Amino acid sequence: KLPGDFGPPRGEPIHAVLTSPPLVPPPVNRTYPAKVIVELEVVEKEMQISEGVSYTFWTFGGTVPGSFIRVRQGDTVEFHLKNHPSSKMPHNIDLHGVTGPGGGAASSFTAPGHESQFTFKALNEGIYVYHCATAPVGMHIANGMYGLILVEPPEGLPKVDHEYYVMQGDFYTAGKYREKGLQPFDMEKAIDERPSYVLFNGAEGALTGDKALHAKVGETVRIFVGNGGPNLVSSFHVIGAIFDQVRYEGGTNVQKNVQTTLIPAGGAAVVKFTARVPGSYVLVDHSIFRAFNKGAMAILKIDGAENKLVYSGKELDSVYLGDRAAPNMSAVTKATQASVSGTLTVQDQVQAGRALFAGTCSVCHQGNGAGLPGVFPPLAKSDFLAADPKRAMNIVLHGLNGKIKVNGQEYDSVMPPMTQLNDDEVANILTYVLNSWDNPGGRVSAEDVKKVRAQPA
Amino acid sequence: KLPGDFGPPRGEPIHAVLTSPPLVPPPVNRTYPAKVIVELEVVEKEMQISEGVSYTFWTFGGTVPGSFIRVRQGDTVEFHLKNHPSSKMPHNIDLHGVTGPGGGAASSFTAPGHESQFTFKALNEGIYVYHCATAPVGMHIANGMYGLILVEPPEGLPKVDHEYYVMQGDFYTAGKYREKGLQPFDMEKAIDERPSYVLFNGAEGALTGDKALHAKVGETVRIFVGNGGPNLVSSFHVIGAIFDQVRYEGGTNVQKNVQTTLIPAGGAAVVKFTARVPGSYVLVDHSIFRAFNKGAMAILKIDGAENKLVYSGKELDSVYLGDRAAPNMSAVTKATQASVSGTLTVQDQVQAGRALFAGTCSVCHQGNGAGLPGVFPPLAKSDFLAADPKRAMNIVLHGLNGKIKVNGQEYDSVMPPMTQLNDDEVANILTYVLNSWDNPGGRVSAEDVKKVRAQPA
Amino acid sequence: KLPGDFGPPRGEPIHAVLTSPPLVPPPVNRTYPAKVIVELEVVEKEMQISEGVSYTFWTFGGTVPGSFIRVRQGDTVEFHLKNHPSSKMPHNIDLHGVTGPGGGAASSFTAPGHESQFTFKALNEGIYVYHCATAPVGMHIANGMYGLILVEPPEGLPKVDHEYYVMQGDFYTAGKYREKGLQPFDMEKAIDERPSYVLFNGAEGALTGDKALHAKVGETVRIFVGNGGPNLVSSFHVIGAIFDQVRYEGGTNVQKNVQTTLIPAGGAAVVKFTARVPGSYVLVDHSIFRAFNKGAMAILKIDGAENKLVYSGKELDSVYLGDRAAPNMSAVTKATQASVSGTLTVQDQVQAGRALFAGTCSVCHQGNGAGLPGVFPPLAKSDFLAADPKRAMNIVLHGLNGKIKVNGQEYDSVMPPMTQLNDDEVANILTYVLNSWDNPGGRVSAEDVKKVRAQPA
C-alpha cells in the first residue's frame, strides 16, 4: 500500500495561492484530498544582491527563494511551469517529495515562452526543497532557482502565531564581496565551492533591519528553513535563543531544545521558536565567516516587556551586527548609482560612509568618533587624520601599529588591515569621517584609494 | 559486561566470502557466534577514474571501495591482510567497529609481499567504514583504500529484495576534471579539500547507464552507503524518491521518511528504499557541483508499470543526467586511446563527440541539432557554423552573445562559456557536429582548440 | 511558563570555580537554584600553536578553549567579563544557552582595562559554546575566543569516573603548516575557510603523548566536546572505540552506539566512552587531512590488562600517529629557538630531526633506518646517501623513482615527494640521518634546503 492513501480527489479543484518570501500561504485547513493546480513562472531578471551590486538571478516566481507552495499529503498536484518569454535559458523543476524520476524534471522541460505540466500525488508529508534541474544544474541553482514546498500532514500542523519562509543559498560572483556593478556568475568559484556571498532570501540585508521578521513576547513562531545550496551545508543557528523543535523534511525524528542544527545542501527543516524576552534574534550559518563576512544573517525581532530576571542586558547593536544593525543601507545604493551617473556628491559619499562606518569602524572608534583616550584614538577632530588624508587611506587598507600621537595623547596599539573593503567603501567611509566631528571636509575618491592599494606605504 | 556477549565461538571456523562492489555477501543466517577468517589483499593498480583518465589506485581486494565484509555481532574475526608483491607502499587497516587501538592498525602493518594477522571480537553491531591507516594516512585513503564491514545484529537484518554497496569518495588529480592521461595524486588539492572528482565506487559512471543498480516496482532495496572521504561530508540524497529508513553505523536512532541525509567523512549508513513507480532514481551528493560537475551520481533503475495517479511524467533524460543518461561513453575511451596511439580517425572523434554532446549541448540545441527557431539557433545544417569553424571553437570556450543570424533567422541571446571542457572534448564535440546534419565535415583537433584557448577572440 | 522554573535563587551566592582545559569543574551537587557569580578575564598573548610556531591568541581566561563554566538549570548567573589592560582590542561574549539578544553581547562590551557585567537566568539545560561577539567576529573567534558552559539538569548528570574538556578549532596563519616564527592571522585564508591548522585545545600535540587524557579499563569517561570553528564542521570520531552516548547541546535526542558524529560549527556535544581494552584511542576530525596533516588528533590513553579475546593487537605507534606517537617534540622547539638565537648546534638539529623522522620517514625506512632489503632502501650506513647529500635534499623535497643501487642492492620503487616539509624540517631530518647509523656526519642547513627548493634537479 502506498503512503498518503486517502482516496480519490474530492471537492472542487483548488488553484493554489503561492506566496513570496518571507511569507507562507495559510494552512490548508482541509479534511479531504484535493486536486491542486499549481502555476509557477520562471523569470530571469537583474536584482540587487547587495547595495549597488546587481546580479542576473533566475527565479521561480520572481523571487529568491521562489514562491512557497503548500498542499496536503494525499493531494493530486497538477503542476504547471511557465518560462517567461524574456528568458534566455530553458528551465524545469525537481520537487523533493515527488515520487517519480527526476522529481518532475523530464516532463517540466520548458523553453522560453513555453509552458509544461505534469501531475503527481503528494505521498510524502514534509517540508521539501524544489529547484531547477536543467543542465548545467549547478549554474541554474546558483542563479537562484530553488524554493520550498510544504506537504502538510492530513490533520495539519499545530497552530502557531506566525509562519515565515527563510532559505539559505551560496552565490558566486566574478567580483569580490561588495564590489559594485553587475556581477557575472563565476563558474570557477562555484566548482571550488568558494562563494562570494552566503545569503538568506537572495540578498544581503533581506531579513535585517527594516526587513526583519516580527513577533511579540509570548508568541510562537514557525520557520520553514531551506538550504538551496548549491554547495554549502548550514550550521544553522539562532543567536540568543533556542529552537523548541527541529524537524527535517518529513522525518519521523523530531529534535527538541537545540540551538545549532546542520542543514544539508538541498535540505529543509521546520523549526519552532517561543518568544520570551524582547530584542533581535539572529538566524545565521554558524560557519562564522559566512554569517559575518558574506551576508548570512537574518533577524527575528521580538517586541514586548523586558524581564530582568531572565535577561538584564541590552538589545543588539553594531558591535555584533555591524552595519546591519541599522534599518537599511540605502545610502550605499544611492551613492553607487550616482557614481555610475557621474553625479556623485560629497554628501552622497558622506551618507554612504555613515552607513558603512557602523561596526566596521565604530567598534573601536565609537559611533561619535571619540575613541577611548589612550586606548583607541579619536577620529573626531583628529589632528593626525587632518595632517595627512593619504596616510589615512593607507591606514584603512594596510593597518597601523606602533606609537603615534593623536590630539596630544600617545597610543601604542594595533589597527588591523581592512584590505577587503572595496575602493568605493574606503573612499566613502573616509569622506564621512572628514565631513563629521569638526574635521576639515573635502573628500576621498575611489580612484584615490585604488592608487594607494596599488602602491602601499 | 561487554556488548556482544554471546559466548565462545562454536561450530566450524568460517572462511568469509567477500564481495566486490556493488554487491553484498548473503545474510549470515546463523544463530551462534563463530570464528570468521577474513583474507583481504592490497593491490596497487592503474584503473580508469573517467573515460581516458587513468589513476594509480591503492585498493583492498582490487576495487574501490574495497571488498565488502559481512560478519555477526559476537563473532571472533581472525583478520589476514596481504600486501601484493607488486606494491610499492606498505599498508595496514583500521576497521571502524573494532574495539582496540587503531582499529587493528599496528598489528596489520604489511610490507609489499608480506602478510599480517590479528584477531578481534565484533562487539558492536552496525555498518562501518574500514580504511588504510599508514602514514601519510590521507594519501592512502585518497588513493582508494576504504570499504565497508557489516556486523549484523544476532537476529539478522530484516529481509529485503536487494542489497547493494555504494561508497562515496573524494579524489585529487594533478590535472583538471576530465583531462586525459595518467593523473598523479595531488597533495596540495588534497590538503585544501579541493577534489577534482567526487565519485561513487571509484569512477565516473560506475553506477550509471548500463552499470545502474536494478529493482522492480514493489520491491525493497537496502543500500549500505559509505563515505570514505578522505575529506568531504556528503549531503546524500535520492532524486525522485524517499528513504524509508536511514540508520548510521550501529546507532540506536533510526530516522524514517527522509530524502536528504548528511554522511560524515568516514561515516556509513544503511538506507532502505521501496520501489513505487518505474524509472531512474539518482543517488547524489546534493552539494550539487559534486553531483553534476565532478561525478557524484549513481542510479537505481526501477522496472515495472507506470502509475499515472502517482506520477504522470517521463523517465529521466540528458537534460538532468547530462552525458550519463546514455548506457556508457565508451567512445570517449576509444578516442583517447587512438590519440595516444597516433591513429585517431574522424569517426573516432565523431563518436566521442556524440557521447559528450548529450546534455552539455543538447539541452539548448536539441539532440538533433535543430534548436528552437528564434530562441536556440540550429547546429543542424548551420550556415553560421560552416562559415567559420574557428569562431565555433571560440564560441564553445568563451561563449557567445548579441544579435546573430543563423539560417536566415535572428537570435539575440546568450550562450554561456564552457571553458571547463578540455581541448579534446571541444575538438570531439565540434567534429561530431561538423559530421552530422548535413554540415560540411572535416575535423577540429585538440591542438586547434589549445591555440584558441591560448588566444581568445 | 518558562523552562527552568525552579523558583527564586536560594542559599548563598556562589562564586563559580572555572577550570582550564582539559579539566572540568566538579558536579554542582545542588538541589536548589542559586545566584552564581562568574568572573572571566580576556587575555591576549602569544603562545605556541606548534613547536617553534608562535601565534597571538585572544583568550577567555588565558587558554584556548577558554575556561569551562558549570552551572545548574534554573540558576541566575551574574556574569562579569574583564578585559586585561594589556589587550589591544575590545571584547565581549555571546553564550549559547542564554535567553536574550546576542547571548549577552551588547551588555558585555569591554574595552581594554575595563569590566562589564550582565545577569541571565539559565533556562536551558545542555552543553553550549560561548564565544566573543565583537566585530570582526570571525577574527576574534579565529584567534581563540571560545569555550564551553555546561548547564546541568536539576538532578545532575549521571556519575562517571572522568570528565574531560576538548574543543576543536580551525586556525588561519599567514605561513604554511609548521612554518616557524610568529605567525599573523590570515584573513584571506579565513574568509575562504582554508585553515592552516585544525586543532584540539589550541595547539598541535595539546592532547597527545605526555598530554594525553587518561583512564583505566572498566572506567567511564564523559567528554564535553566543543567546536569553536569559526568555520569547520567536525566529522568527530574515536579511532578504535565507540561512543556509548552522544547528546548535542540540550537536545532531547540522544544517539547511542556511534563512532562518527557531525558537530556543527558553534556546536557542542556530550559523549560517553567505556574503557574496554588498554591502549590509545584517538579523537579526530575524520575529514582526514585535518586529523593527519593539520593537527586534529587528541588521545585518550587507557591503562590496564589486555584481553586477547577482544583484541589481540598492539598499541598504536608512529605508523598511524606519526610524529605524535612519542611523548613530545620538545627538541623541535629547542632547535627553532637556537636558530633564532644563532646558536643552532649539530646536536640541536639531530634531536629535532629524530622527533620529525618518526612516521614521516620511519614508516618505510624503519625507526632504525634499516628499510627492508630490496623493497625500502636503508638509510643506515647508506652509501647512496653519503655519496651526494644534495641529492638527498632533492629526494626529500621532490621524491625519487626508478632503479637505484643502495648498499649493493637494486631498488625499483617510488618515494613520493614531501614538499610540504619546511626547509628547517628537511634540514633537521637529514642532519639526524647523517649523524646516525654510521653515516658520515656533518649537517644540512635550512638555507641549503631553501636553495634546492628554488631549483629542483
Ligand code: HEC
Ligand atoms: C579596532 C580593532 C579598530 C578598528 C575596527 C578600526 N580602527 Fe582605526 N585605529 C585603531 C587603533 C588602535 C589605532 C591606533 C594604532 C596605533 O598605532 O596605536 C587606529 C588608528 C586610526 C587612524 C589614525 C589615528 C587617528 O586619526 O585617530 C585612523 C585615521 C583610523 N584608525 C581610521 C579607522 C577607520 C576609518 C576605520 C574603519 C574603516 C577604523 N579605523 C577601524 C583601532 C581600530
Ligand code: HEC
Ligand atoms: C543553452 C544554455 C546553450 C548551450 C548549453 C549551448 N549553446 Fe550553443 N548557443 C546557444 C545560444 C543561445 C546561441 C546564440 C547566442 C546569441 O548570440 O544569440 C548559441 C550559439 C551557438 C553556435 C553559433 C550559432 C549556430 O551555429 O547555431 C554554435 C556553433 C554553438 N552554439 C555550439 C554549441 C555547442 C557545440 C555546445 C555544447 C558544447 C553548445 N552550443 C551549448 C545556447 C546554448
Ligand code: HEC
Ligand atoms: C615510503 C612511502 C617512503 C617514505 C615515507 C620515505 N621514503 Fe625515502 N625512499 C623510499 C623508496 C622506495 C626509495 C627508493 C626509490 C627508488 O627509486 O627505488 C627511497 C629512497 C630514499 C633515499 C635514497 C636511497 C637511500 O639512501 O636509501 C633517501 C636519502 C631517502 N629515501 C630518505 C627519506 C627520508 C629522509 C624520508 C623522510 C623525510 C623518507 N625517505 C621517506 C620510500 C620512502
Ligand SMILES: [Cu+2]
Ligand atoms: Cu533553470
Ligand SMILES: [Cu+2]
Ligand atoms: Cu534536489
Ligand SMILES: [Cu+2]
Ligand atoms: Cu595503504
Ligand SMILES: [Cu+2]
Ligand atoms: Cu577511520
Ligand SMILES: [Cu+2]
Ligand atoms: Cu574578542
Ligand SMILES: [Cu+2]
Ligand atoms: Cu555563536
